Amino acid sequence: ESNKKFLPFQQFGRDIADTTDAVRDPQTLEILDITPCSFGGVSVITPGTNTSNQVAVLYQDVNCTEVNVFQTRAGCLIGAEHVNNSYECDIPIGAGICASYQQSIIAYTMSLGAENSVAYSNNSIAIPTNFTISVTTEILPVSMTKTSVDCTMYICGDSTEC
Amino acid sequence: AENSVAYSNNSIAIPTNFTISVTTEILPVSMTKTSVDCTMYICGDSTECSNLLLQYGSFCTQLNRALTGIAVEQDKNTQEVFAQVKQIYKTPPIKDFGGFNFSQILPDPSKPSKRSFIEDLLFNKVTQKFNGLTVLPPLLTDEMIAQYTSALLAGTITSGWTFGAGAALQIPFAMQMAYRFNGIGVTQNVLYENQKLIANQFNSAIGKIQDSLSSTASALGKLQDVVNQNAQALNTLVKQLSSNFGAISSVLNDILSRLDPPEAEVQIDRLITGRLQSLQTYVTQQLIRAAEIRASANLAATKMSECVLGQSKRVDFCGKGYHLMSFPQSAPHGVVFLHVTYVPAQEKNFTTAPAICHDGKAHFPREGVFVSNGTHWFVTQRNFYEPQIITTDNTFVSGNCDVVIGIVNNTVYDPLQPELD
Amino acid sequence: GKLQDVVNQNAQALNTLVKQLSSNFGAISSVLNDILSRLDPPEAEVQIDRLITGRLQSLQTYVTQQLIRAAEIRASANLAATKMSECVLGQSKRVDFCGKGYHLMSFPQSAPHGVVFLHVTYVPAQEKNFTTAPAICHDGKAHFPREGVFVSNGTHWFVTQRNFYEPQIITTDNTFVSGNCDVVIGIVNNTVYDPL
Numbered sequence: 160e161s162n163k164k165f166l167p168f169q170q171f172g173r174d175i176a177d178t179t180d181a182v183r184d185p186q187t188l189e190i191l192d193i194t195p196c197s198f199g200g201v202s203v204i205t206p207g208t209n210t211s212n213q214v215a216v217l218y219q220d221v222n223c224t225e226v227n228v229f230q231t232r233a234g235c236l237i238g239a240e241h242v243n244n245s246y247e248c249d250i251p252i253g254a255g256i257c258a259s260y261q262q263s264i265i266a267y268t269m270s271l272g273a274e275n276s277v278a279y280s281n282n283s284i285a286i287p288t289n290f291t292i293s294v295t296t297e298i299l300p301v302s303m304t305k306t307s308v309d310c311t312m313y314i315c316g317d318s319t320e321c
Numbered sequence: 322a323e324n325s326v327a328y329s330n331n332s333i334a335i336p337t338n339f340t341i342s343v344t345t346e347i348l349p350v351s352m353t354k355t356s357v358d359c360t361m362y363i364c365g366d367s368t369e370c371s372n373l374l375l376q377y378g379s380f381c382t383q384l385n386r387a388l389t390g391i392a393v394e395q396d397k398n399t400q401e402v403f404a405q406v407k408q409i410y411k412t413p414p415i416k417d418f419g420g421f422n423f424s425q426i427l428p429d430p431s432k433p434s435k436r437s438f439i440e441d442l443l444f445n446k447v448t449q450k451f452n453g454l455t456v457l458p459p460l461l462t463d464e465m466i467a468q469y470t471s472a473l474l475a476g477t478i479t480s481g482w483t484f485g486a487g488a489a490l491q492i493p494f495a496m497q498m499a500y501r502f503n504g505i506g507v508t509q510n511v512l513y514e515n516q517k518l519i520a521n522q523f524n525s526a527i528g529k530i531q532d533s534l535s536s537t538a539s540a541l542g543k544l545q546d547v548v549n550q551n552a553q554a555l556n557t558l559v560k561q562l563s564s565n566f567g568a569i570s571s572v573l574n575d576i577l578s579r580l581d582p583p584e585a586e587v588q589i590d591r592l593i594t595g596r597l598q599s600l601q602t603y604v605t606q607q608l609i610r611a612a613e614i615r616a617s618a619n620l621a622a623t624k625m626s627e628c629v630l631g632q633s634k635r636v637d638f639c640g641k642g643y644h645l646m647s648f649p650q651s652a653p654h655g656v657v658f659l660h661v662t663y664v665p666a667q668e669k670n671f672t673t674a675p676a677i678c679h680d681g682k683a684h685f686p687r688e689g690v691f692v693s694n695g696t697h698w699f700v701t702q703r704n705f706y707e708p709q710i711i712t713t714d715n716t717f718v719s720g721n722c723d724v725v726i727g728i729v730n731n732t733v734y735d736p737l738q739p740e741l742d
Numbered sequence: 743g744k745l746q747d748v749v750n751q752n753a754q755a756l757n758t759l760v761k762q763l764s765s766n767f768g769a770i771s772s773v774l775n776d777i778l779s780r781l782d783p784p785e786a787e788v789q790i791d792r793l794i795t796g797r798l799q800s801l802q803t804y805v806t807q808q809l810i811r812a813a814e815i816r817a818s819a820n821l822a823a824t825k826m827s828e829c830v831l832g833q834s835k836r837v838d839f840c841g842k843g844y845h846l847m848s849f850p851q852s853a854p855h856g857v858v859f860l861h862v863t864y865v866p867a868q869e870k871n872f873t874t875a876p877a878i879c880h881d882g883k884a885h886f887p888r889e890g891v892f893v894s895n896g897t898h899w900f901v902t903q904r905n906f907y908e909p910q911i912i913t914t915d916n917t918f919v920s921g922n923c924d925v926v927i928g929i930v931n932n933t934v935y936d937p938l
């Protein structure tokens with residue numbers, strides 16, 4: 160049933176790109192609404208075949224009443240149990256939720272790191288007494304492969320009349 | 322405005338005061354993550370139209386892989402900028418920083434989504450799945466992005482910037498600014514003898530920030546353009562679903578209902594060819610636009626690791642002036658920096674000389690300028706007027722008084738001689 | 743992963759290009775040789791042009807991504823050209839530009855279609871709690887440190903550098919006098935040694 164108020168001289172209704180939202184019943188003269196049954200992508204979360212042959216299917220942005228069940232901001236999970244403790248992210252589900260395999264598949268709001276707060280007073284300082292020299296790597300790409308495709312041969316391919 | 326510097330040899334201008342300034346800088350970090358399934362535009366839930374689409378190779382597979390590539394990337398743009406601290410520091414519960422306020426930048430003990438008093442304005446001065454359209458949610462919610470910025474703030478205002486080297490080292494904020502005077506060539510004694518004035522000047526600068534943001538028509542225009550281009554490049558894409566492209570009608574369901582298969586395959590193929598070309602064009606433009614923000618999220622990561630996690634000698638990058646420190650503030654789809662700098666003011670001119678001829682030997686300053694008010698010569702640091710009597714302790718002797726041009730004959734006070742007598 | 747990924751995309755966008763040669767594009771066959779002879783030229787030219795437009799439009803695509811992906815390499819090939827100059831051929835004070843720590847030096851080493859930097863840094867460790875003071879009032883005059891901190895173990899006051907604990911007795915050659923101990927908030931009384 161359409162709550163939006165209409166006028167009697169004409170029947171169909173639409174907003175953008177020829178998408179008819181409402182329609183007028185011919186016989187009963189009743190105004191209805193049109194919204195399609197929800198679609199959406201499906202994402203499969205796996206911890207790797209070597210570890211185990213288990214998956215946690217996620218349905219992207221569905222109410223989960225029209226498809227361990229769990230409802231997230233990104234969608235709905237099937238196969239992951241919510242856990243109170245927060246771990247570092249392993250598989251990013253989305254909207255601040257991550258999953259991992261460790262009693263099969265868990266789903267937690269990831270923690271941002273080891274929380275700490277050292278003391279601070281207006282007349283105390285901390286000075287290091289020693290040092291550790293460390294070597295860290297860093298990788299940067301510089302070039303690609305220099306392919307060169309001639310346009311004539313690819314399109315035609317040995318055909319004079321082409 | 323027209324200027325003409327009163328240039329003349331042996332004449333210099335040295336400032337006698339300073340004015341703390343806080344200037345905001347706004348950078349976009351990421352844009353909206355939209356994923357479009359190529360099959361639902363061209364066909365639109367039609368089995369008899371899908372078969373015609375697979376005749377076009379694997380175009381619909383690239384247009385799904387390309388958009389997914391520039392959607393995972395947006396979760397790396399946010400990671401590079403904010404996620405730069407191993408731990409999550411916290412401010413002490415008793416705030417006594419020697420005069421500096423910081424109550425407009427620190428998290429609010431108030432209504433949830435604990436943003437700063439400034440971040441509330443930034444999240445209010447800027448303010449869908451219908452047909453194949455999607456909007457994936459960002460991995461980092463604004464409730465956790467506001468905690469990276471809090472963690473960075475809760476450590477930069479309390480322990481210097483020893484984060485860029487490893488372990489956090491506590492140090493009172495009253496003696497942080499003394500360090501960063503030495504960076505810009507100003508003796509630390511200027512801070513301590515002017516601490517009360519400096520704290521009030523710094524506090525007033527922050528107070529005018531939210532006034533300069535809320536009252537002004539649009540300071541966040543850099544962040545608004547990104548939204549105004551994504552939402553506009555999508556309307557033009559959606560509105561292209563109502564164009565005939567040379568077919569009998571622009572809606573696919575009304576073609577299959579009044580045409581047999583052998584002659585409907587030619588009317589559909591005009592929509593398929595047109596709509597496919599009407600989707601490759603926008604995907605290409607998103608790839609170019611994503612690279613523009615990618616280069617902007619790499620500059621915002623550099624500013625976080627140089628202006629915020631240290632002091633930068635680079636000119637006119639961490640603010641217009643001599644950089645002191647920066648404070649990062651979150652944004653709907655970006656980040657805002659508050660550069661703190663010194664601008665010299667209230668300058669007075671004097672007469673100089675490159676050397677001082679005493680005892681037949683040239684004298685040069687160690688760190689300072691030989692300056693004379695008209696009768697007596699003094700030595701002052703180049704960024705602040707503080708005259709001192711010329712002494713062998715702040716000058717060094719190297720050369721003879723017959724090579725350099727411009728010497729003035731003057732006596733260099735020796736401190737050992739009168740103590741000896 | 744950075745170097746290996748670049749190889750895959752080049753070999754993925756090129757394999758996809760090759761597979762585009764076996765698509766009808768709305769024509770009667772995906773093989774051009776079997777359309778030239780099986781059909782008359784008057785009606786072959788309208789079916790061949792379907793393949794020509796399909797293949798040409800499928801060739802303009804991968805050129806664009808190759809053009810776009812090239813800019814992603816030159817952007818990353820200017821960081822290497824900058825890190826090689828500023829960090830290998832010198833010492834950089836830019837924080838976190840060439841490692842996590844205080845930069846000392848780096849060594850460049852080649853890699854297939856890339857470069858690898860071994861950033862040698864200086865990470866402080868084993869900190870120690872201390873009690874400090876901004877200045878010291880001796881004979882009514884303030885004494886700020888020339889370079890270092892006025893640290894105190896609890897009873898005695900020393901001067902040490904800011905990045906390594908190395909305590910030294912406070913003398914007139916370690917501190918410089920300016921003003922009197924009446925404006926500094928937090929000055930601590932102590933005696934300054936005179937080496938003369």
Ligand SMILES: *[C@@H]1O[C@H](CO)[C@@H](O[C@@H]2O[C@H](CO)[C@@H](O)[C@H](O)[C@H]2NC(C)=O)[C@H](O)[C@H]1NC(C)=O
Binds near residue numbers: 291
């Ligand atoms: C400073 O740093 C090292 C830690 O890296 C301290 O421990 C020494 O480490 C080296 C190599 O492992 C050993 O050869 C020493 O025997 C260790 N010294 C110990 C355990 O006392 C080192 O003590 C620290 N201080 C000095 C002066 O080196």
Ligand SMILES: *[C@@H]1O[C@H](CO)[C@@H](O[C@@H]2O[C@H](CO)[C@@H](O)[C@H](O)[C@H]2NC(C)=O)[C@H](O)[C@H]1NC(C)=O
Binds near residue numbers: 327332668669670671
């Ligand atoms: C600047 O140095 C000389 C020393 O006498 C003076 O020259 C004037 O400089 C100002 C700009 O600073 C110019 O606008 C004037 O045209 C200059 N000539 C004058 C006033 O006759 C001046 O006294 C010094 N400026 C100050 C504030 O002391």
Ligand SMILES: *[C@@H]1O[C@H](CO)[C@@H](O[C@@H]2O[C@H](CO)[C@@H](O)[C@H](O)[C@H]2NC(C)=O)[C@H](O)[C@H]1NC(C)=O
Binds near residue numbers: 895897898
């Ligand atoms: C700091 O802790 C103790 C307490 O002062 C120091 O022990 C004395 O330090 C002074 C000079 O540092 C010596 O002259 C004394 O002989 C020490 N003993 C007494 C009873 O005063 C200790 O040396 C200090 N630590 C450091 C590294 O200097």
Ligand SMILES: *[C@@H]1O[C@H](CO)[C@@H](O)[C@H](O)[C@H]1NC(C)=O
Binds near residue numbers: 187188
């Ligand atoms: C249309 O036909 C049905 C069946 O009798 C009945 O509701 C009525 O005759 C008509 N409906 C109207 C006038 O609303």
Ligand SMILES: *[C@@H]1O[C@H](CO)[C@@H](O)[C@H](O)[C@H]1NC(C)=O
Binds near residue numbers: 221222
């Ligand atoms: C799912 O449906 C229920 C009831 O209609 C509602 O409470 C909940 O907010 C919905 N979740 C969504 C729209 O994500």
Ligand SMILES: *[C@@H]1O[C@H](CO)[C@@H](O)[C@H](O)[C@H]1NC(C)=O
Binds near residue numbers: 243
């Ligand atoms: C998990 O957290 C909720 C509240 O945050 C609490 O009610 C519940 O008891 C907790 N369960 C476990 C196993 O910790």
Ligand SMILES: *[C@@H]1O[C@H](CO)[C@@H](O)[C@H](O)[C@H]1NC(C)=O
Binds near residue numbers: 277278869870871
């Ligand atoms: C320094 O003192 C504070 C006060 O509790 C403490 O938190 C900190 O651990 C101390 N540092 C060391 C190395 O013990």
Ligand SMILES: *[C@@H]1O[C@H](CO)[C@@H](O)[C@H](O)[C@H]1NC(C)=O
Binds near residue numbers: 416422423424425
């Ligand atoms: C800091 O700024 C706020 C805002 O006006 C003010 O209320 C407060 O008195 C100032 N000082 C402290 C210690 O909070």
Ligand SMILES: *[C@@H]1O[C@H](CO)[C@@H](O)[C@H](O)[C@H]1NC(C)=O
Binds near residue numbers: 281
């Ligand atoms: C530091 O704080 C204490 C009380 O919190 C105060 O008495 C003192 O004046 C401040 N300054 C110094 C150098 O102790």
